[PDB]
Structure formats: C-alpha cells, structure tokens
Amino acid sequence: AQPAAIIRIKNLRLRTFIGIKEEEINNRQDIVINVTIHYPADKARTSEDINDALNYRTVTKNIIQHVENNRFSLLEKLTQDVLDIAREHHWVTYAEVEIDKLHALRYADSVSMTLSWQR
Amino acid sequence: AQPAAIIRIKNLRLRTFIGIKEEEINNRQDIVINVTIHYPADKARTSEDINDALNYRTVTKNIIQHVENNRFSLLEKLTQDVLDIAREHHWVTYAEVEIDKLHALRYADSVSMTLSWQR
Amino acid sequence: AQPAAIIRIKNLRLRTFIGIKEEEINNRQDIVINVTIHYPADKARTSEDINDALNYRTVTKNIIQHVENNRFSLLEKLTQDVLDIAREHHWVTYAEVEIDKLHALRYADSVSMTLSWQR
Amino acid sequence: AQPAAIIRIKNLRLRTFIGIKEEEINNRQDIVINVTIHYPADKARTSEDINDALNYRTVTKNIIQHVENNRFSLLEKLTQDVLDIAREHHWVTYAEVEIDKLHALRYADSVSMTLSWQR
Amino acid sequence: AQPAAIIRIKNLRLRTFIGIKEEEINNRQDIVINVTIHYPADKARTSEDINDALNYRTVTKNIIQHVENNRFSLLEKLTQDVLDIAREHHWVTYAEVEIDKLHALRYADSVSMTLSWQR
Amino acid sequence: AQPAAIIRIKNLRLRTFIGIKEEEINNRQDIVINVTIHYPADKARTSEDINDALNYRTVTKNIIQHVENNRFSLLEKLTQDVLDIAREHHWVTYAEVEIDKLHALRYADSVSMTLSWQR
Amino acid sequence: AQPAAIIRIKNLRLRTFIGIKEEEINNRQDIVINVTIHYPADKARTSEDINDALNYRTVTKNIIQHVENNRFSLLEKLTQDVLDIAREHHWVTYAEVEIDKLHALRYADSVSMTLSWQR
Amino acid sequence: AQPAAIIRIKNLRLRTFIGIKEEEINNRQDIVINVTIHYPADKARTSEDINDALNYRTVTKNIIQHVENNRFSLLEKLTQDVLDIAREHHWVTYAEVEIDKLHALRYADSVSMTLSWQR
Numbered sequence A, B, C, D, E, F, G, H: 001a002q003p004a005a006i007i008r009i010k011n012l013r014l015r016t017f018i019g020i021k022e023e024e025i026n027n028r029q030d031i032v033i034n035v036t037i038h039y040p041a042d043k044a045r046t047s048e049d050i051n052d053a054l055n056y057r058t059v060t061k062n063i064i065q066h067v068e069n070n071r072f073s074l075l076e077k078l079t080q081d082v083l084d085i086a087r088e089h090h091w092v093t094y095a096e097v098e099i100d101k102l103h104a105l106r107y108a109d110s111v112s113m114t115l116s117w118q119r
Helices: A022-026 A041-045 A056-068 A075-086 B022-026 B056-068 B075-086 C022-026 C041-045 C056-068 C075-086 D022-026 D056-068 D075-086 E022-026 E056-068 E075-087 F022-026 F056-068 F075-086 G022-026 G041-048 G056-068 G075-086 H022-026 H041-045 H056-068 H075-086
Strands: A005-018 A029-039 A094-102 A108-117 B004-018 B029-040 B094-102 B108-118 C005-018 C029-039 C094-102 C108-117 D005-018 D029-039 D094-102 D108-117 E005-018 E029-039 E094-102 E108-117 F005-018 F029-039 F094-102 F108-117 G005-018 G029-039 G094-102 G110-118 H004-018 H029-040 H094-102 H110-117
Touching: A005 A022, A005 A041, A005 A056, A005 A075, A005 B094, A029 A056, A029 A075, A041 B075, A041 B108, A056 A075, A056 B108, A075 A094, A075 A108, A094 D005, B004 B022, B004 B056, B004 B075, B004 C094, B029 B056, B029 B075, B056 B075, B075 B094, B075 B108, C005 C022, C005 C056, C005 C075, C005 D094, C029 C056, C029 C075, C041 D075, C056 C075, C075 C094, C075 C108, D005 D022, D005 D056, D005 D075, D029 D056, D029 D075, D056 D075, D075 D094, D075 D108, E005 E022, E005 E056, E005 E075, E029 E056, E029 E075, E056 E075, E075 E094, E075 E108, F005 F022, F005 F056, F005 F075, F029 F056, F029 F075, F056 F075, F075 F094, F075 F108, F075 H041, F094 H004, F108 H041, G005 G022, G005 G056, G005 G075, G029 G041, G029 G056, G029 G075, G041 H075, G056 G075, G075 G094, G075 G110, H004 H022, H004 H041, H004 H056, H004 H075, H029 H041, H029 H056, H029 H075, H056 H075, H075 H094, H075 H110
Parallel strands: none
Antiparallel strands: A005 A029, A005 B108, A029 A094, A094 A108, A108 D005, B004 B029, B004 C108, B029 B094, B094 B108, C005 C029, C005 D108, C029 C094, C094 C108, D005 D029, D029 D094, D094 D108, E005 E029, E005 G110, E029 E094, E094 E108, E108 F005, F005 F029, F029 F094, F094 F108, F108 H004, G005 G029, G005 H110, G029 G094, G094 G110, H004 H029, H029 H094, H094 H110
8 A cells, every 4th residue: 555645625715914015915815725634544544543633624723713813925924834734733744735826917817836844 | 658557437426424423423415536546558458358357337336335325434434445445356556545525624615535555 | 957848638529439238339428538748848849840740630630530430349449549549650758548438437427547658 | 845835827818829820820819828836945935035036926927928929830939938938037946837729629628738847 | 676585595416216217217316406486575584583484494404305205207297396395385476496307318418397386 | 387397408519510611511510509498387297197298308319310410501590490390399388499609709608599489 | 778787796705604503603604795786878878977976896895894794693684785785876776686605505505595676 | 489589699708908097007907798689580591692691700800809909998888889889780689798897896706787779
C-alpha cells in the first residue's frame, strides 16, 4: 500500500477583508479555500479507537473562525495562516492550501495562491 | 509504452448511513464515490480472451450492494471497505478510492477521504 | 526550460457501437475522447518552417473517421486504436488517450479507460 | 515546507486573431489562457517589505495588452509569447501556460497548447 | 400587491421503480421532482403564530415516503400521486408538479411530466 | 384540475446536415431538440389502462430517424418537420418544438427556432 | 412598444439566520435572492436627465444591509421585507422577489418563497 | 395553430464601455446579450424563395458592430439601441432584448435590463 490518507475540504466559501485599497478594506470579498491534508493511512483506520484523532470538522471550524474575524493585507499572509491552521495536528505529514480570490482580475475567473508544508 | 491500463468509475452516486450522531444514524446521506484502478495493459487487450478478466461492472455491483446495505461509523471505515473491494481482483496493480461526503461541512461543497493501495 | 509542448484535444464527442450485447450492438453509444500529445518544444516554434508538421486537425479527422465507421467489442480495443492513431506522427514523444463511455454503469456519470505510450 | 508559492491566473478570457486563413485573419477568435507561476515561498510573505515584488496584476496587464493588440499565425507563437511574459520577473522559478482555442475542431470543446519553462 | 405566496421545492432527487420492462422493474431509476405550491399571501405572514400552517417539510416527508416505498407503472400515475400529496393542505390554491425521468430516452437528458391543479 | 398533461422531451441531441453552403452540406452539425406536447390529463392516468396511448418513445424514435436520415436546407423546414411529427398523435392538444443550432453565430451560444401548433 | 422596463438583480448571495431551531438560530444559512422590478419604459431613457432615478445599486445596498444585520423567524417575513425594499421607489410598477433557502430540505437543492406586488 | 415563429439569439457575449465612472470608461465590461424575435409563421417557411427575408446573421452582425464600436452612458440606452436594431426588419411582430451587465453589483451574478416592442 501507499500509507497516506488524503483529506480534502473542497470549496469552503467565505468572505473577508483582503487588500489595503479603500474599497478592499471597506467591503468583504469572496474567497474560496481548498485544503488538502495528508497523514498516515494506518492511524486513519484508528480514528475511532484513539482520541488524538484528526478532526476535519475542527480544522474547518478554526479556519472559518480565523478568516471571518480578521482583516488581511495580502493573500500570502492569509494563505499562510490557514496553512498553519491545517498542519496544526501532530498527524499531519503534508498539507496544501489554495485560496481563490474570485474576480480579482477583470476578464479572468480568479487568481489563486497555493502554499504547502512537508514533514 | 507505459504498460498500465487505467479504469475510472466516475461519480458513483449513492446514499447510506455514516456517523454516530442521532441524525446521521437516522438519515441516509449523499456520497459520491470515485474509483481508479490500474492493471497490465497487455492483458487489457485480452479482456474477451481471458475469463479471469477484470469486470468493472462487477466491481461496481459489489460496491453498491455493500454500501447501500450497511451503516458506517466513519468515512475511513467506509473508504477502506471500498478500496478493499476495488483491489480484490488479482490483476489490480494499483487502486484508489475517493469518497465525498456531500455537505458535511457547512459553507463547503464537501469533504472527501482518499485511500490507495499498491502491488 | 522543459522541452515538451503539450497538445490537448478536449472532449471530442462521438457516437459508436461498443459491446457485444444485443442493445450495445444495436444502438450507438456516447463516448467522450480526450487526447494528450507531447512533442519537442523547439520543433513547435518551427512547425511552420518545413512541410511535415504535426497537425492536430488531421489526427482528429482520422480518429473521427475511424471511430464512427466501425464497431468495437471492448473499450480497450477502441482506446488502443485511437492511441495508435494519435502517436502515428514521428514527432510524438508521448501520447495519452482517455475515453469515457457515458452512463455505462447505472448511478455513475461514466467509466473511462486510459492508455498511454512513451518514446 | 516545500518552498514554492504557486500563483494561478484562471481562465483569462480574451479575443484575438490567430491564423492565416481569410476567416481567421478577418475575425477574432475566442481563447482562454491559464497561467501558473512558481516563486520562493519565503519572499511571498515579504510582498510589501520588498517593493520590486511579483505582481500578478501587472503580468495579466502585459498579457492582455500584448494579446489584444496583435495578430498571430500559430498557436505556438502566441503561447510562447505569453510564457515569456509570465516568466519575465526574476523571482519566477517555474512557469506554465495553457491556451485553449475555443471550438477550433468540430465535435470537440477545444484544443489547447501548453508550454512551460524551468530554472 | 398580488395575494399569492409561491413555495417551490427545487430538484428533490429520489430513486424508485418506474416502468414495466424487466430492467425498469429490477433497477430503481433516478427522477427529479419539482413542486410549486401557491397559497394566500396574507396567511403567509402567520405560520409562526398558528399551527394549522402549510409545512413544506411535511409535504416533502410525505412525498419521499410515498415515492420510495412504492412501485410505479406509469409516470402519469406517479406524477398524479405526488400532485395530490402536494395539494392536500386546505390552504393550497394552485399546485403543479413536474417529474423528470432522467435518461429515459437515449440521446435526451430526460423526459418529464407536468400536472397541475386549481381551486 | 387544469386537464392538460404536459410531456417534455428535454435536450434530444442529434447531428445532421443543415444548410446549402459547401461546409454545411459536407459536415453534419450539432443541434439540440426540445419538444413540449400537451394532451388530456384524464386520459393520462390511462395508457396501460386505456388504448391509443401517447408513447413519447415512439415520437422520439420517429424524430431521430427522420432527422438523422436527411439533409435540410433551412432550420424552419426542420423545425416544422419535427412539429408535424410531434403533433401526429390524435390526443395532442398543443405541441411546441425549439431547435438550437449550436454555435451558428460566432460569439453566441446558439440560435434557435421555435414553432408551435394549436387545437 | 410595451412600456415596462424590467430590471433584474440576479442571484444576490447572502447569509443570515432563518428559523427557530437551535441550529438555524446558531448558524447563518445560505440564501440566494432574485429581484424583478418593473417601471415605465419612457422614464428609463430620461435617466441621464433627471436626478430621482431608480438606482439598482441603492436597492441592493439596502437589501444587503437589512438582510445581514438581522435575524428572521420565517422565510415569508424575510421575503416580504425584501419585497418592500424592492418596491420602495415611486417608479416601481411591479416588483417580484424570490428567495432560495439552500439545502433546507434534505435531498432537494433548495426551497424558495416568491412574493410579488402590483400598482 | 399559433402563427408566430420565434428566433432566439442566445448569449451573444460582447465587451464594451458602459458607465460614467473613471474605471467604467477606461475598461470594457462584459455583457451578455439575448435577443428574442417573433415574426409570422407562414413567412418562415418561405424564407428561402424570397430574399428580403429576415436574416438573424445580419441582425447579429449589426448588433455587434454597433455595440463594440461605441461607448454607452446607460444600460437603458444600450438596450434600446439593440432593441431597435432587432425590430428593424418589417416582418418583426414582437421583439425582446435582455442585457446582462456581468458582476455589476458585488455579491450578485449580474443585473440585467429587458425591453420589448409590439406591432
């Protein structure tokens, strides 16, 4: 086998302040967050036996909480904060986070920033 | 040449019980399964030539039957169960299974669990 | 640089006979073809400075003509044939062909078969 | 960590002249561009401190300006032109560009050309 | 003003037996139900004060119950059974029900039946 | 009761020759057919039960056969031919037919022609 | 001419509290609002002439402010409040408001409430 | 019968300047035009004998030429202009024009203006 269980939180849609421009700081913007988390496949089947358990519900709760109650200057800062929150649990082997800033550029669907973490 | 034929079963849509919370155990939930199976490309051209053939139809029938006729505690148990069903045939070189649990997280399209197997 | 120009022929939608069952042989089924072709990046810019260039229009023409005017017993035979048609040209470094047999399994969007070739 | 911040400019939809055939040169055709850019993750969190930063807004600006105000003979020339525009900034580690020529083939959604650069 | 509150139950996705042919009676098929119910606008602003109220939840519960736990020979019968269930509440002025039998015709996304009731 | 049962044949996708221009006559084009047919609601609960049943399956079979096995000079002619075929059954009260000529105009999704019949 | 200009505000996506159940009151839900406003077509052109013009921007502003900054007991109250906000201006001849409470019924895409006003 | 042929030009996607604000006048915006035209059904079948015929290709050609080569202050003006170009031909019984101004309001897919003409 390939001992890596992958958890995907697809299209978490939130709104928050990103940017320094008058408008950007005055109105919330639409962003789409996608999180990919890797962790040992054996501990996965163990999810119910032990309570250290990685809870995607908690990861999401935290991300939502942190994003909605803050103002951000750069996409980079935001993407990092969420990455840190995703790889917080000690089972996390690898974690990746992509954030789409919807309609940030005119004539394009979005621009996204993706950051990852190893070990 | 890269001697691996890949079969994908795209968006098998089913309903079953997943969870322990009253609601979860009382109501079936929507899940979407995706199966990726790899096997020797040479034997692929021999699929009406050899009876010990890999039948994606059977694989599907089994999965459906197993999933619709049970109650599961965690996505992990369910995903593994299916992975085992996918990689049951002796030609299976590699097998992957991703299961989306639709609208499990509020404000998110879904959360999915992917597991795989080698050799 | 990474000297490999990738050409993608997206969702070539065709109808043809696939199967041995009475219905399958009596009615054309929908299939979606997706072809990925690689070839040297340098020759790409010089595709118009000679007279034997890779023509995605011809490849497509041949695939259509070959797929619509025939009957196929198995997905694998059909996929291989197309892959052959794809890598026919002497510039092709690599070629991949995925063919979706739409609504082949009930409750599933489709099932596809992928095959590739190197060197 | 995996020191690479990825920036994606998704579906930049533009119209321009591609081809030599009368119709091609008399009427603009629809294209969809997708740009993927990689650069050092550490500098990413330093996008305000270090003022000569990588600006996706500028990259897009140049691409649009360059594409909407020119005529192209081959998809390859155009794709390359954009690729160069993308990897123009000195932080660019890797860059990939895919360009879809919408409805270039009949019976197919589109045909795309993808080109990338390293180091 | 125009004293009619319109409640719409959008895409209620269910599976059941529809048909007489061996296959149709052996495998449940996918159907999508849409329900439109009109009722006095003035009474609408009172469903929190009174308990003789129109509960879209009860309507749904009954439809699901009735459709999943039964077998149907004709779309018309099924559509009528549902129409009666929807207009059962004494507040209902108008009621319309459409039922799509997904992929019932080959080469057509679906075929639907719509029936309505007045007074 | 508003005694009018409505049958909708949704998105019947076919290919056939439309036009007089060389290309139009040399290559089949994609068209999307939508048929709406009205007939008595009372007789509707009767097809298994009562006689000369309106078989949406026979109507479609006839449309497909006639469309695919011919060449048409104008959309209008084609839409009429289908309309006639659709209102051929003696129970038909009303019949409507919209035909999309996919990507007929550049820059637009499609152009359609709608024709209907009464009594 | 048919002297009625129609302004549509399509898919205004907002989140607010709707319901009385513990979960509905503790967590905001996703609703999609659609507004249809009619007014004399002649006055519409005199818009770059007069000052008391109908401003869809202001209407939206008010709808957003009112919806996000409050809690609602029933869909009916929310829809009415919005309807009133929509027909506030003296040019409005007819006003219609549909509100989708996304995934309010399990197994259904949404449930909506539409209300309208005349004169 | 119901002697009214309906021609729909679906989603004509164009870019042009709309508004008075610095940004709006400096950058073209995305608009989607939808045109609906009615004309006598009898004349429709004779749209191949005569040549003073209603040509949807000309209508579209005219629409585009006028839209792309001008600047508009108000949606109302733009929509009227298009409505006029569509009902220009003497066969036109009724004409309708809906214009979506994509992402005009923040938090909404768009805002559209519809205008129609009779006789």
